Amino acid sequence: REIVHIQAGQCGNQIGAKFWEVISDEHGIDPTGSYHGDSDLQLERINVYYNEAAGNKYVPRAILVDLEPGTMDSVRSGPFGQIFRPDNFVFGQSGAGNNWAKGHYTEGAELVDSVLDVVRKESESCDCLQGFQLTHSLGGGTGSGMGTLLISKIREEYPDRIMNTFSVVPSPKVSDTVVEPYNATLSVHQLVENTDETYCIDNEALYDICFRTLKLTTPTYGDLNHLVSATMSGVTTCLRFPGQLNADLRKLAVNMVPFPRLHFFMPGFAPLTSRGSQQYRALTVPELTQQMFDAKNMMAACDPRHGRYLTVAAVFRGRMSMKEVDEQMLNVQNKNSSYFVEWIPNNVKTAVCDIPPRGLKMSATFIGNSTAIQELFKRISEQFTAMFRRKAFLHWYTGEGMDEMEFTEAESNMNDLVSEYQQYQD
Amino acid sequence: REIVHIQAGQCGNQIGAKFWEVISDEHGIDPTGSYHGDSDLQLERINVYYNEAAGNKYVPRAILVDLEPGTMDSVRSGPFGQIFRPDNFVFGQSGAGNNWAKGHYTEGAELVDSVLDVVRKESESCDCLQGFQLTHSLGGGTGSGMGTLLISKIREEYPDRIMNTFSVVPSPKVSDTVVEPYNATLSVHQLVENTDETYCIDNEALYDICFRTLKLTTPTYGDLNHLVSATMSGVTTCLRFPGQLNADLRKLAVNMVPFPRLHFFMPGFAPLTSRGSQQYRALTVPELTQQMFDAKNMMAACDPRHGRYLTVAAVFRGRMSMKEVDEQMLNVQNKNSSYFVEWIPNNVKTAVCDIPPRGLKMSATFIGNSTAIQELFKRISEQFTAMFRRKAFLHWYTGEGMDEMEFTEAESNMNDLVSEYQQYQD
Amino acid sequence: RECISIHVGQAGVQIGNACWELYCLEHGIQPDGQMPSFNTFFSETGAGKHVPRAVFVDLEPTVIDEVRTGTYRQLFHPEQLITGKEDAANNYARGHYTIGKEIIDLVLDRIRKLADQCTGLQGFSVFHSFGGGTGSGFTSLLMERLSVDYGKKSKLEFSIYPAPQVSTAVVEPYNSILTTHTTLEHSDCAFMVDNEAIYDICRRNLDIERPTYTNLNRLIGQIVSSITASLRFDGALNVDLTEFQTNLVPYPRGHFPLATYAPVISAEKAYHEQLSVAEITNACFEPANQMVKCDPRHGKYMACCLLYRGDVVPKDVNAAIATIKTKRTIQFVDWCPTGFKVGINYEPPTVVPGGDLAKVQRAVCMLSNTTAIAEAWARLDHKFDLMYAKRAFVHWYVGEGMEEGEFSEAREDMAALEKDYEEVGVDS
Amino acid sequence: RECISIHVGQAGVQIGNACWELYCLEHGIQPDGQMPSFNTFFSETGAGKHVPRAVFVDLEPTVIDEVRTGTYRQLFHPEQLITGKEDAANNYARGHYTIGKEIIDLVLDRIRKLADQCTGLQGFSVFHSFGGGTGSGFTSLLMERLSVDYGKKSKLEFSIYPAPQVSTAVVEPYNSILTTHTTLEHSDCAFMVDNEAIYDICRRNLDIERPTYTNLNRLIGQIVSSITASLRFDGALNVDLTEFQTNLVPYPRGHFPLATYAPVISAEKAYHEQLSVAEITNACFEPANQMVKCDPRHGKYMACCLLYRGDVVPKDVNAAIATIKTKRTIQFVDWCPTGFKVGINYEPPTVVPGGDLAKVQRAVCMLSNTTAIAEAWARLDHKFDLMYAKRAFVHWYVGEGMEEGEFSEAREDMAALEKDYEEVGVDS
Ligand SMILES: Nc1nc2c(ncn2[C@@H]2O[C@H](COP(=O)(O)CP(=O)(O)OP(=O)(O)O)[C@@H](O)[C@H]2O)c(=O)[nH]1
Ligand SMILES: Nc1nc2c(ncn2[C@@H]2O[C@H](COP(=O)(O)CP(=O)(O)OP(=O)(O)O)[C@@H](O)[C@H]2O)c(=O)[nH]1
Ligand SMILES: Nc1nc2c(ncn2[C@@H]2O[C@H](COP(=O)(O)OP(=O)(O)OP(=O)(O)O)[C@@H](O)[C@H]2O)c(=O)[nH]1
Ligand SMILES: Nc1nc2c(ncn2[C@@H]2O[C@H](COP(=O)(O)OP(=O)(O)OP(=O)(O)O)[C@@H](O)[C@H]2O)c(=O)[nH]1
Ligand SMILES: [Mg+2]
Ligand SMILES: [Mg+2]
Ligand SMILES: [Mg+2]
User: Fold this and answer.
1) CA distances (Å), C204 to each of B177, C267, D380, in order?
2) Whole-angstrom Cα distance, residue B170 to residue C338?
């Protein structure tokens, strides 16, 4: 039942920082690693994410990896740096320069072999691995490059374990580097063959959530990465705590993947609104389902209603009735049937567990698999072709040794994914 | 059973300040929000206007809104500022300049969206809304502009809830701004379609009450707004406390509106006389009915006897017999039958409840719906046409983007209302 | 909701001197910058020193040096004290271009610095004369650039109107007319004030034998703070600068409200007198208290706004308005029905130590858009005609590069302006 | 992951002077070597003294003596201060061979000493001019030997591009062209910088009346540390020198990325200004902030890399990139799809005491491979042609043993280079 988490790149490092913060909050673990919880259940499945160290202290089953010391140090300096063991800090000293070729192909590979040995050590300490979780960017050098190398090696060693990853998706309004589409394309190409699932979160959408719904004037990554961590913890709540339905991630994978190559997901979250209105809220399941269905509360920058749904997973936290949840989610499909694909009767599946998030009575996490997602791939592939056709900046990757066909084939596979969404779309 | 109150503009802010003061007095709520009442009944329906905060403290279900910080701050600085939560202070920083176009059409709209979210929050906290109450001016920029925007959005969201508003009506002797008729016309145009009822109170008449009957040499708004609050609290006394007849505002609406578009009311009040004579008073129902019928005790600047009554509502507070009240009010109709419209046998309806106003043994609130009201609309429409014909100052509204036809149509609807009063008049 | 004050020329700077002195008096600011307490006009440094958000420009060092030698020089940041080396010789040609063009870029960047310091700039106010060089010409240049980068921010201008009595330049009409056009092109609201009317008030209501600019500036400065400080501080009915735009300008061109102010009474005459809200506002509708030489009874009203300080109740204002409507002779134009806007603060009027006016418990500022302003324009047009008929002194501008047609043009634009006021006054 | 800095000529040494001063400032290094705290550039002795891993060579004692008399002479090891006795007379013939050949063996062995001191040398960076003698000619000689013994280590070169304005040698084109060829033969990446563009930035963005080399060097030095120190210190997205090779050079010949840097703003103009990640990167794509005299809008992009210091979030960068793609006029060549690489450190930008730039919270270095570089080459080709047409001054090289065909040859090689940039720019 255990999961090994790996943080790659600043994105990975900071999002994961928030993730581990939250998970320790879930179990009553203080920043020193000491358990001071509230419930027995907090310990009962603590093993998924922690090792019990002498003295009832816990160590997160996760590896922090990068090519820049400063980042790693900044994470270690904060709360929760203390909970991590020195053994999990693997890093170099010179970033990749946002170059997948430097991260994946050359330099990052040098660290990856030591990372893998630590991975192996941890998998050996585990009783039974459930899977692996990676947090990284789709556009960065170690996040997409190094991280994808690591993934190919882990899946190789553990074919039946669940490989999932959470990753930051480029947007026209975000884009930092000109070769960001190049890095994305190359990573996608690999991820589509080497993962079981990946979550596509876009900072653009996250900013909109922060202002529009959360009423923040200054969205920061500290809060943006908070929202991601909410969804990341949501997916293993049932795994960690008793409940009624679908606790296992594999069960979820079975119900969420109709076709081997379409494994990209749209996370969302409810309740997600500022405090000002919270005094007028009345959470009910219909209320949570209204917010989860609404595209504005999606973390992915994509409106599902533009495409069609293949699968929907909803995970509920806190004590709700079976009827209420199952009736209401059925009703979502009933009322919005035009946005679902007719192949699957009962497209909405639910998971329900008995432990609510600290501070809320109830909560719900949304995982969608809709053909609308192809739009995100269009943004990347399009931008790519413009660069690629002229070979602008290509020399920086050819300097590493990358072949034009390596990129060409990478594009090809991206085009395949879009076409497959279209084949299922309609 | 709950009501959300919103204070818009200085008028709204100050009248509402007195209103909430009174309502807390009604229930034994001190300025801190703590309950120290006298009766169980004070708590029994406290929910209409309050939320129970931890520690038996109550928070008024109402939002304070303006474009000028100073006003808002002055309200908050007084007693009862403490009872309000920070969440209900919504404001900008630059008034509208008395321009409906700035309040309704442009600037005020920017705040209205945040106001509405707070409204929604509060309506969610409520068990069942009965309705909404707004307090504002008919001539000001946020009072008539912003407030009417807010109303169109609230009614949109809650079609079956009672929308009522209390508002200050311009008079030849009061008029401050040259475009006050312009603001009034535009607000009227909207209010006639978007509210269920509005009370028309004129400061002129209020000043006359203060001197003539109350023997005050210096009428101040502090006292003038007191008189308004008396009538505002009167209409929900039965709602809040047990009684015998007509507690519900909707019931009153049903009995007071014979035609969808004629929903303007003439409030009045008894007993209303200075202390000097109070030692010679002997309140009886005939005494209260004498004062309530008498036009001099009306808060609206309009004498009903110049027109004809469509409906009369009288609300009685304190322990009076059924006979006394029903005989005497019947007798009013009997004795003054020439001022009532023959369509409705039994034009006078009564409400009677068992809880008197603090300090009085008995009290009565008068709500009239007489065709005489058209005179107030004549004052506005006339003044309007003089300005409008020459387009004096119009450029200030056209600067915002208002169309001459927007005003033209607004006038048209005012003319319709007068003609409808005439159609019913006789 | 912050602002910037720009002072150009001696007229702008000397007025500004009183303005910032007044702001110090309003909030207990020491000359050293230390103040224990106005953030709209000041920013604070980590030392607890506050700095006036303003820029002072004078093409001749002289006046700026005066500032630099005064007590408030410790308040002002050195970068805000900008000077040239030669004046414009009372001449727009130099002010606007030949000389001023060489400094203006410095000025604008210091403005930008302040613009970046502000978080939510509502706008800015500029002080200058119509007849000077730097004050008129340079000012024109300045507004051309400010409307480019700021655009939409409030452009309030306070301009001194040349009096027939005081006249310090023979080509003042020419200077003024050139300026006017550009203010029409880029300001949002222009307030012109006549020192000769002010003197009349000072000699009769303040009872001052011999008014000087220092006394005149005190009066004006207080009026300006009654418009702005009073908005910043909050009161009952706060009225933003954007509302003034919305409410005071009916058409893009009619942006010339005039100011009248009361109580303007000496301490000695104030004893014994107590003015009600209504009484002060009655003083505000008297021509004798008007700060511009024109006749309010002659013209018609289009817009009027009354701002109140201290002890005022809305009800009393309501009564006062009725009185103005009924008493008066306030012929409002059909185009605007009823146009009276009311702003009421709680902040009490302040008194300058060593002042000339009584301490008052309530004060009223009257802003108004009236057709009488055309009168003043007519006077300037005539004066221009005389000078231009002969073409006396024309070489002082032409020799600096100006075009004859430029002068013709500007006059014509003013004629159009006056005609537009006529048109609006025509009831329809 | 260590490196060596090689400074040749006054251009290389004086730039180096600021570079090591900056490194001292980055880590709190005292002139005496004492430092309590950069091991990539310094080694430590048992005394706790740190020694710059660098070699300073000047064929004329003069400049080295300047170093020897400065405060940092206690930092530098005497063996690292190498000098000849006569300059190259601005002439490659002497720099590369006649004179320089007599010292170069010393130099190389001191380099070896440092190479043996390093444990994991990533590579080295060299500073020099294109037009000098020692700086160009000697440099050529040096690179010939370094590629023999080190080979594969990073060969970064920073070359000063002769400006049309500043020209200090009539045979600069000849010197430069000879050099160029050899840098094509042995460098991995050459960065040429034009002092004339830099001056333009200093006079407009730093507002400096009179720039000198000392100010110019400060700017460059900071850029260089933003590339290297920033890699050594670790951040979020660390980017190694090998990744730059891999990502910036599409073909063996196109090794000439140019640098642009922002924020380059004076303290006075920085007040009030706050630049976001996106805004700074917008400044980085402006030609006006380009450190090389060419037009980025004219050429096309092939590779671009943005390095960040201080307060930067990947998300903001992502947005900035989208903006560049959409705003711009960044015509990227088909040959490279999308080529933008991003490196993000946490290390904040540093400030030199007595500096000329504002303290900044985030800083951006832009490296880019663009076809506009050909422009500069065209200018040099033309100049050569003129001199070579007459064969003026040719005897100063020929008399030192150079062959006519050698000059023809080198020019031709540059022509080929420019043509190769053309070809890559041709979309396919
Ligand atoms: N009975 C009362 N009438 C008032 C009061 N204050 C104002 N008014 C009346 O209301 C109208 C003027 O409006 P306000 O103060 O409410 C304007 P408001 O602040 O809503 O908007 P702005 O245009 O942004 O200032 C006018 O008929 C005044 O005469 C009050 O306290 N009591
Ligand atoms: N929601 C978030 N996205 C981030 C964050 N930091 C970066 N990013 C995003 O990730 C991508 C840039 O990547 P990084 O910081 O992760 C690069 P990384 O450090 O993995 O590799 P290098 O190339 O060696 O620097 C980009 O889309 C940024 O915009 C973060 O904290 N939160
Ligand atoms: N109210 C007031 N008016 C002033 C003051 N100083 C000057 N004025 C008036 O403004 C005009 C004078 O402008 P000048 O001082 O000649 O010139 P300037 O506008 O400062 O610029 P230059 O011509 O270049 O010196 C005259 O009409 C004066 O009556 C002052 O302190 N207060
Ligand atoms: N940025 C910068 N450029 C410099 C500096 N010193 C010189 N240069 C430039 O580099 C070139 C000068 O090279 P020189 O100083 O003549 O010669 P050298 O390269 O040191 O070698 P020799 O000719 O043998 O003395 C000119 O183009 C100068 O503009 C400096 O400190 N900073
Ligand atoms: Mg002057
Ligand atoms: Mg107001
Ligand atoms: Mg030299």
Assistant:
1) 30, 13, 81
2) 11
**B48 vs A209: CA distance, rounded Å:** 33
> Which residues touch C418 (CB under 8 Å, ≥6 apart)?
C374, C377, C378, C381
Q: Say yes or no: domain A1-258 is CATH 3.40.50.1440.
A: yes
Give the Cβ contact number of residue D417 at 10 Å: 20
Give the residue from B384, B267, B368, B227 showing the smallest Cα distance to B310. B368
Is C90 a pocket residue for ligand 3 (Cβ < 6 Å)? Answer: yes
Looking at ligand 3, which residue's alpha carbon is closest to its atom 12?
C132
- Identity of the residue in A73, A91, A176 whose CB atom sits nearest the CB atom of D342: A176
Closest CA to A79 of A36, A136, A116, A31: A31
Would you kindly state where each structural domain of chain B is located, as residue ranges?
A: 1-258, 259-372, 373-426
Three-state SS at D113:
helix
Task: Name the region of B33 (left: φ>0; alpha: ψ -120 to 50; beta: rest).
Answer: left
10 Å Cβ neighbour count for C79? 14
Spell out which residues of chain C touch residue B176, defining contact as CB-CB under 8 Å.
Answer: 306, 317-318, 321, 338, 340-342
Residue D370 and residue D299 in contact, taking contact as beta carbons nearer than 8 Å: yes
Mutate to test the interface with D, among A71, A225, A395 (most CBs of D within 10 A): A395
- Which ligand is located closest to the Cα atom of residue C131? 3
Alpha-helical regions (H) of D150-234: 172-186, 195-204, 213-232
CA distance D404 to D216: 36
Tokens encoding A23: 């998970």
Angle at which helix D404-425 crosses helix D172-186, to 10 degrees, equals: 60
* Integer angstrom CA distances of residue C377 from C138, C256, C417: 22, 11, 9
Residue whose C-alpha is closest to residue D15's, from D69, D58, D74, D59: D58
Task: Pick A386's closest partner by Cβ from D233, D277, D332.
Answer: D332
* C17 Cβ inside 6 Å of ligand 3: no
CA of A263 to the centre of ligand 3 (A): 76
Level-2 CATH architecture, domain A373-426: Orthogonal Bundle (1.10)
Residue type, A345: P
Q: Which residues contact B107 (CB under 8 A, 6 or more apart)?
A: B67, B92, B94, B96, C242
Q: How far is CA C177 from the centre of its chain?
A: 17
Find the residue in C nearest to D270 (Cα): C113
CB within 8 Å of C423: residues ≥ 6 apart = none
DSSP reduced 3-state for A370: strand
The DSSP code for C273 is -
Domains of chain C in start order, with CATH, are: 1-257 (3.40.50.1440), 258-372 (3.30.1330.20), 373-428 (1.10.287.600)
- Which among A215, A275, A280 is the nearest to B120, CB-wise? A280
Looking at the domain A259-372, which fold is it?
A: 60s Ribosomal Protein L30; Chain: A; (3.30.1330)
How many angstroms is the resolution?
23.0
Task: Report yes or no: D1 at the A interface, CB cutoff 8 Å.
Answer: yes
Residues 6+ apart with CB under 8 A from B372: B266, B302, B303, B304, B305, B306, B307, B308
Distance of CA B253 to the CA centre of its chain: 14
Whole-number Å distance, alpha carbon C114 to ligand 3 midpoint, is: 26
- Counting Cβ atoms within 10 Å, is residue A392 exposed (0-12), middle (13-18) or buried (19+)? buried
**Centroid of chain to Cα B146:** 17
In a mutational test of the D interface, the residue from A175, A201, A226, A382 whose CB has the highest number of chain D CBs within 10 Å is: A175
Tokens 């015998």 correspond to B244
A18 touches chain D (CB under 8 A): no
Q: C63 C-alpha vs ligand 5 centroid, how far in Å?
A: 7
